[PDB]
Amino acid sequence: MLTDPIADMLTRIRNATRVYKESTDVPASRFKEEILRILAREGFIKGYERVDVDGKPYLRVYLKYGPRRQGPDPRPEQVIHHIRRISKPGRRVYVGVKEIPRVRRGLGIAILSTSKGVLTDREARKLGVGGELICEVW
Amino acid sequence: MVKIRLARFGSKHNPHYRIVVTDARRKRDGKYIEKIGYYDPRKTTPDWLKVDVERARYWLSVGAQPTDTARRLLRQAGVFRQEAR
Amino acid sequence: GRYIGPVCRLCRREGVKLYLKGERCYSPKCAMERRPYPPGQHGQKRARRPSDYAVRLREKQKLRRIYGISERQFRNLFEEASKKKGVTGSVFLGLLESRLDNVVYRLGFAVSRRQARQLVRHGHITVNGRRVDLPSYRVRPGDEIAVAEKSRNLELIRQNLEAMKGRKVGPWLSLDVEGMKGKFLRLPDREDLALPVNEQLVIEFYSR
Amino acid sequence: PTINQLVRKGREKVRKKSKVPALKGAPFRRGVCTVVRTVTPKKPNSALRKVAKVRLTSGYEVTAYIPGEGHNLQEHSVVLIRGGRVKDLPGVRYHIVRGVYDAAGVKDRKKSRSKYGTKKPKEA
Amino acid sequence: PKKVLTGVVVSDKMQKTVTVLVERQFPHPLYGKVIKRSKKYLAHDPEEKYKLGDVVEIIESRPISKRKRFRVLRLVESGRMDLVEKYLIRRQNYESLSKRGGKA
RNA sequence: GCCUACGGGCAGGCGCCGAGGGUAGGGCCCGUGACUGGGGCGAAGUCGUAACAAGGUAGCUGUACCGGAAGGUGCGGCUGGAU
RNA sequence: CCCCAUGUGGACCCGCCCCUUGGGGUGUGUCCAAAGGGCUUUGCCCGCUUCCGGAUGGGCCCGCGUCCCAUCAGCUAGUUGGUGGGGUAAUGGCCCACCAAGGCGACGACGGGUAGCCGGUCUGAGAGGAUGGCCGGCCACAGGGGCACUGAGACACGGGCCCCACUCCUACGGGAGGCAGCAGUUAGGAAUCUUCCGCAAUGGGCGCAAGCCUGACGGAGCGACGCCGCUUGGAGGAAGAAGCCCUUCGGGGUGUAAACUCCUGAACCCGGGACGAAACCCCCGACGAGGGGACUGACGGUACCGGGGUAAUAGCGCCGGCCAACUCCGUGCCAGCAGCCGCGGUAAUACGGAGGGCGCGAGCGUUACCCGGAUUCACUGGGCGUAAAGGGCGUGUAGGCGGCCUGGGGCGUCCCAUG
Ligand SMILES: [Mg+2]
Ligand SMILES: [Mg+2]
Ligand SMILES: [Mg+2]
Ligand SMILES: [Mg+2]
Ligand SMILES: [Mg+2]
Ligand SMILES: [Mg+2]
Ligand SMILES: [Mg+2]
Ligand SMILES: [Mg+2]
Ligand SMILES: [Mg+2]
Ligand SMILES: [Mg+2]
Ligand SMILES: [Mg+2]
Ligand SMILES: [Mg+2]
Ligand SMILES: [Mg+2]
Ligand SMILES: [Mg+2]
Ligand SMILES: [Mg+2]
Ligand SMILES: [Mg+2]
Ligand SMILES: [Mg+2]
Ligand SMILES: [Mg+2]
Ligand SMILES: [Mg+2]
Ligand SMILES: [Mg+2]
Ligand SMILES: [Mg+2]
Ligand SMILES: [Mg+2]
Ligand SMILES: [Mg+2]
Ligand SMILES: [Mg+2]
Ligand SMILES: [Mg+2]
Ligand SMILES: [Mg+2]
Ligand SMILES: [Mg+2]
Ligand SMILES: [Mg+2]
Ligand SMILES: [Mg+2]
Ligand SMILES: [Mg+2]
Ligand SMILES: [Mg+2]
Ligand SMILES: [Mg+2]
Ligand SMILES: [Mg+2]
Ligand SMILES: [Mg+2]
Ligand SMILES: [Mg+2]
Ligand SMILES: [Mg+2]
Ligand SMILES: [Mg+2]
Ligand SMILES: [Mg+2]
Ligand SMILES: [Mg+2]
Ligand SMILES: [Mg+2]
Ligand SMILES: [Mg+2]
Ligand SMILES: [Mg+2]
Ligand SMILES: [Mg+2]
Ligand SMILES: [Mg+2]
Ligand SMILES: [Mg+2]
Ligand SMILES: [Mg+2]
Ligand SMILES: [Mg+2]
Ligand SMILES: [Mg+2]
Ligand SMILES: [Mg+2]
Ligand SMILES: [Mg+2]
Ligand SMILES: [Mg+2]
Ligand SMILES: [Mg+2]
Ligand SMILES: [Mg+2]
Ligand SMILES: [Mg+2]
Ligand SMILES: [Mg+2]
Ligand SMILES: [Mg+2]
Ligand SMILES: [Mg+2]
Ligand SMILES: [Mg+2]
Ligand SMILES: [Mg+2]
Ligand SMILES: [Mg+2]
Ligand SMILES: [Mg+2]
Ligand SMILES: [Mg+2]
Ligand SMILES: [Mg+2]
Ligand SMILES: [Mg+2]
Ligand SMILES: [Mg+2]
Ligand SMILES: [Mg+2]
Ligand SMILES: [Mg+2]
Ligand SMILES: [Mg+2]
Ligand SMILES: [Zn+2]
């Protein structure tokens, strides 16, 4: 059965992008939509929009790519080169502030769930708090 | 009985002592209650004796009889001296 | 002990001029001037390409040999240099250069680094008014490095300071020729030392 | 494994078995010789190799290679043995140290002398 | 602070005493999962007042018997048999698991 | 029996607990060891030629029976079986 | 040592008030103290008694952490709890009597194996592994096993009682002894030190002090066992002696190396010569503060200083690849090498010698062991169609894990302050 719906979200985006889908729908959730809200700001996705599939709450994620390339394979650079779930059910991953990590020498994101919100590594380290280490992106 | 005495901490031919509060019975260089200043018998430095008076005064005030060389060193930094009239 | 034995020869194994000798290392006699190949039966024969180890090794040796120094004293400094806040490649040379044996030579009291170690060890050197004779003593900035009042009259002491008539001393140092004193001003920045070493290769050799 | 599997069953560290049991933890043992014989080597090699069978202070009866171009070992030679297998002679996981007890150094040896108990000759 | 734990009664069968089952969660020291280990405490019930299924608070105490070093502190929540069942079935299954034998 | 201020104390005597030992009867772990199983080896020979090519009866496999052994056959199963 | 008295005060029963596990107060009854010595003798010093608090040192108890085997799966009857009693400084099956039938275990009970634990240390990028002499902290033992006595404190290493094993004395009834204190003897072993100096220092015991004691400790000795520092020279010196080695016989190599020239001056000689040690004490002052005075050094005639002053130990591994370093000769699957792959059967850069070279240098190698390399137990950080690896298939227990919205709790989790 479904056990991690945030994995499922991330992985939906991952697989989507690799086929250069313009967009994919993901069953909605206050939480997921927060993570998306983050991904939006940081420019990994053009944005998400809340839609309705058969009267079921969903979230249309609109993916973003590189420019076309010359050479014999022209499939654009990815913008979300690597997305990956860190704290998972059946091994949760809590990080204290002085243990929140750096993703790709500052070039990537770690998305954190804290008692002060869903924060990026930088956002969280600025508010001086830590929490559950959800995923990493770059 | 609690004592104020010397705990050697130098090398060989390099004696460096440490003024300390400790139960009579502990090893000359053992777990001590509280350190109250160092003392360097050879005076290799302009500062070969410090004491922290006010602490030592406290410990004497609850009767930590100090050894003879220690009383001397204490006295020298004037743990005992009063004032005026 | 330290290395005693034939030197213009390491001059040759390293294939560059180490100035381990002195008055003739400068003349048309360094055998680099006469036989620039390495010592032995086979130095005439064309070389094999060096392994990475080879190049890492030799660059280490070249640097070490230049300075006198045992590998145990050498490695121990490179060790100390890594424990330093700094760019160890540079920090190292600064540390090397801080040796009394060396400071003396750079000062121009001794013809060479080898001759310098004796000048130190036989007591001919003042550091801050006192005697020092460990070639390994570390000179810090602000230190004054003089000739003993006693040893003031040596032929080489006087003969060498008369070459100072026309040399000028390193930029991190100051010489008082007449007074026979020198002062150590600061550590030499990398750009001051102009050795034929690629310090980085040395570092690499040690991270194996 | 899953995580819960490692929490449940852990990881099994790896135990190292000693290729030199006869020396019960020490670096050499002394023994006396029983058989001192020659033995024919293994796979692609030919020769007649010198081997001693040695009764140890550790109780074990083991066989030991006698290194060196020529020796002087015998039915009651007191000798000392160290680690060091010989690939060609199987069931030989110890060497005999030369120049100790009743094992002479090699005579005439002028090169890797410390490995053969030969002292440095004068006038060389 | 005398220690205070919270747990459930799994045993009446003792004179002036209850067995309290206390759970504790904590991350695994290497694998960092949260693991649910547990312990049984013998608690002085001077009045029989606490029945089985009661969740209770229990407090560090001047020694009573050999094993009794805790007093029952107060009632947290009474009637909670699900937990007690989990204790008993965990127990019952033990009589399997053997090697002397089994049945059909 | 001793001391006493006549209240009692001391020696001594008995009893439980008890280290240890005795008899019987179990269980366990090391030392030696009569007689033995194969096994891996390790020098190139005996008698076969099962497998590798369709290996000259496709091969393998569990289980049987025969055979000292290699193997043979029976009953199924597998293709990791060649045209 | 003991009885009587005063009892500030305390102890005990009983009752009340606050407090709350046996805490503080209070009231009647009871019960409990004591020691003298010295002198600079009409008052000072040391000591005595009961009690309240401090100080320091310990007992006991609880949470959490604490190696391997499941080819050890069930363990337990003082066992688990109760009530009462004994004992203790005090809780407690710690002990005893009676009552109840409990206690523990797959979150590994019980059994077997191994081990003193830690601050740390070694390694490692980390995580982790490994280790716990030497220093410091806790524990445990003092020839094996019991046991209590003195006491603030022990069930006591150089105290006591008994049994056993060992050794010695013995008149054969009996008795003696305990280095895992320092040094040493001996055995065992690959292997581990002087039957040294000193109580000068610091520390400890006893004393008013002078002092006594102190194998704690402060030092010397022996061992490259380890780390660090130092030396065996420095400068000049040939198109380059000899000898040894290679050679295509032209020459090349050791090699500025040597010789030889100047310079310096470890060793050593003479002279001076420590710091560590100033208190205890005595005197003035008050017995305080403060001031004055004297005694005291094992190391050690050492370190260190001054003057003089001699060119004055070098060895070990290695040179096929990993891996820095190549030639000749001997040998001929022999002798031998060998960490691994391999080398040697007549041209061996791998055996052996030589020259030459490389690497370190009072050290260099070898063996043994830990960590590394070994993402080769994979938390970081691995796998399972054919490489080792999916249970023959299902059912389902414990357990693990689990959709969308809102709200409470705040256990996990996160932040701050403090210990
Ligand atoms: Mg944390
Ligand atoms: Mg000395
Ligand atoms: Mg104590
Ligand atoms: Mg490394
Ligand atoms: Mg290994
Ligand atoms: Mg018995
Ligand atoms: Mg066939
Ligand atoms: Mg066939
Ligand atoms: Mg046939
Ligand atoms: Mg047949
Ligand atoms: Mg068939
Ligand atoms: Mg009261
Ligand atoms: Mg009375
Ligand atoms: Mg009297
Ligand atoms: Mg009973
Ligand atoms: Mg009771
Ligand atoms: Mg042990
Ligand atoms: Mg690693
Ligand atoms: Mg570590
Ligand atoms: Mg340990
Ligand atoms: Mg110790
Ligand atoms: Mg210790
Ligand atoms: Mg003994
Ligand atoms: Mg005993
Ligand atoms: Mg005693
Ligand atoms: Mg004891
Ligand atoms: Mg003794
Ligand atoms: Mg001894
Ligand atoms: Mg012996
Ligand atoms: Mg004293
Ligand atoms: Mg000592
Ligand atoms: Mg030494
Ligand atoms: Mg040695
Ligand atoms: Mg050295
Ligand atoms: Mg020639
Ligand atoms: Mg010269
Ligand atoms: Mg002279
Ligand atoms: Mg003195
Ligand atoms: Mg003085
Ligand atoms: Mg005075
Ligand atoms: Mg004295
Ligand atoms: Mg007076
Ligand atoms: Mg003298
Ligand atoms: Mg002199
Ligand atoms: Mg002179
Ligand atoms: Mg000489
Ligand atoms: Mg190497
Ligand atoms: Mg090479
Ligand atoms: Mg060899
Ligand atoms: Mg070799
Ligand atoms: Mg050779
Ligand atoms: Mg040679
Ligand atoms: Mg050589
Ligand atoms: Mg590993
Ligand atoms: Mg994993
Ligand atoms: Mg693998
Ligand atoms: Mg197969
Ligand atoms: Mg397979
Ligand atoms: Mg299957
Ligand atoms: Mg299978
Ligand atoms: Mg379930
Ligand atoms: Mg759940
Ligand atoms: Mg949920
Ligand atoms: Mg919710
Ligand atoms: Mg809420
Ligand atoms: Mg809260
Ligand atoms: Mg909370
Ligand atoms: Mg937390
Ligand atoms: Zn030169």
mmCIF file of all heavy atoms in Angstrom, chain B residues 23 25-26, chain G residues 57-58, ligand 3:
data_model
loop_
_atom_site.group_PDB
_atom_site.id
_atom_site.type_symbol
_atom_site.label_atom_id
_atom_site.label_comp_id
_atom_site.label_asym_id
_atom_site.label_seq_id
_atom_site.Cartn_x
_atom_site.Cartn_y
_atom_site.Cartn_z
ATOM 1 N N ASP B 23 41.145 16.205 51.239
ATOM 2 C CA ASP B 23 41.068 15.385 52.446
ATOM 3 C C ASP B 23 42.469 14.898 52.728
ATOM 4 O O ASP B 23 43.132 14.362 51.835
ATOM 5 C CB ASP B 23 40.114 14.189 52.253
ATOM 6 C CG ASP B 23 39.951 13.315 53.519
ATOM 7 O OD1 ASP B 23 40.947 12.937 54.177
ATOM 8 O OD2 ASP B 23 38.798 12.984 53.854
ATOM 9 N N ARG B 25 43.921 12.467 53.604
ATOM 10 C CA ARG B 25 44.374 11.131 53.292
ATOM 11 C C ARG B 25 44.641 10.867 51.814
ATOM 12 O O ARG B 25 45.098 9.783 51.466
ATOM 13 C CB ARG B 25 43.368 10.119 53.840
ATOM 14 C CG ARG B 25 42.703 10.583 55.107
ATOM 15 C CD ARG B 25 41.511 9.709 55.429
ATOM 16 N NE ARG B 25 40.258 10.457 55.552
ATOM 17 C CZ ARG B 25 39.148 9.945 56.078
ATOM 18 N NH1 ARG B 25 39.153 8.698 56.541
ATOM 19 N NH2 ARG B 25 38.043 10.679 56.155
ATOM 20 N N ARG B 26 44.377 11.817 50.926
ATOM 21 C CA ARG B 26 44.521 11.460 49.521
ATOM 22 C C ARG B 26 45.945 11.545 49.041
ATOM 23 O O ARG B 26 46.728 12.323 49.580
ATOM 24 C CB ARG B 26 43.597 12.244 48.599
ATOM 25 C CG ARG B 26 43.036 11.302 47.553
ATOM 26 C CD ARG B 26 42.267 11.990 46.464
ATOM 27 N NE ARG B 26 40.892 12.339 46.821
ATOM 28 C CZ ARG B 26 39.897 11.465 46.980
ATOM 29 N NH1 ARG B 26 40.115 10.155 46.862
ATOM 30 N NH2 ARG B 26 38.678 11.910 47.275
ATOM 31 P P G G 57 35.259 15.040 49.937
ATOM 32 O OP1 G G 57 36.060 14.995 48.676
ATOM 33 O OP2 G G 57 33.850 15.501 49.886
ATOM 34 O "O5'" G G 57 35.338 13.641 50.684
ATOM 35 C "C5'" G G 57 36.591 13.054 50.956
ATOM 36 C "C4'" G G 57 36.462 11.904 51.904
ATOM 37 O "O4'" G G 57 35.927 12.365 53.166
ATOM 38 C "C3'" G G 57 35.507 10.814 51.482
ATOM 39 O "O3'" G G 57 36.076 9.927 50.548
ATOM 40 C "C2'" G G 57 35.157 10.166 52.809
ATOM 41 O "O2'" G G 57 36.246 9.378 53.279
ATOM 42 C "C1'" G G 57 35.049 11.399 53.693
ATOM 43 N N9 G G 57 33.700 11.977 53.675
ATOM 44 C C8 G G 57 33.360 13.131 53.012
ATOM 45 N N7 G G 57 32.111 13.455 53.174
ATOM 46 C C5 G G 57 31.596 12.458 54.000
ATOM 47 C C6 G G 57 30.279 12.271 54.516
ATOM 48 O O6 G G 57 29.277 12.991 54.334
ATOM 49 N N1 G G 57 30.195 11.118 55.306
ATOM 50 C C2 G G 57 31.246 10.273 55.569
ATOM 51 N N2 G G 57 30.998 9.228 56.360
ATOM 52 N N3 G G 57 32.471 10.435 55.093
ATOM 53 C C4 G G 57 32.574 11.538 54.321
ATOM 54 P P G G 58 35.139 9.198 49.488
ATOM 55 O OP1 G G 58 35.987 8.219 48.759
ATOM 56 O OP2 G G 58 34.445 10.265 48.719
ATOM 57 O "O5'" G G 58 34.098 8.438 50.427
ATOM 58 C "C5'" G G 58 33.654 7.127 50.123
ATOM 59 C "C4'" G G 58 33.152 6.417 51.354
ATOM 60 O "O4'" G G 58 32.889 7.382 52.400
ATOM 61 C "C3'" G G 58 31.827 5.691 51.204
ATOM 62 O "O3'" G G 58 31.932 4.433 50.592
ATOM 63 C "C2'" G G 58 31.331 5.626 52.626
ATOM 64 O "O2'" G G 58 32.087 4.674 53.363
ATOM 65 C "C1'" G G 58 31.710 7.017 53.099
ATOM 66 N N9 G G 58 30.657 8.011 52.782
ATOM 67 C C8 G G 58 30.869 9.090 51.971
ATOM 68 N N7 G G 58 29.830 9.855 51.825
ATOM 69 C C5 G G 58 28.860 9.259 52.587
ATOM 70 C C6 G G 58 27.534 9.692 52.759
ATOM 71 O O6 G G 58 27.000 10.706 52.247
ATOM 72 N N1 G G 58 26.871 8.796 53.603
ATOM 73 C C2 G G 58 27.425 7.663 54.182
ATOM 74 N N2 G G 58 26.631 6.916 54.968
ATOM 75 N N3 G G 58 28.675 7.270 54.000
ATOM 76 C C4 G G 58 29.339 8.115 53.191
HETATM 77 MG MG MG H 3 39.625 8.459 51.401
#
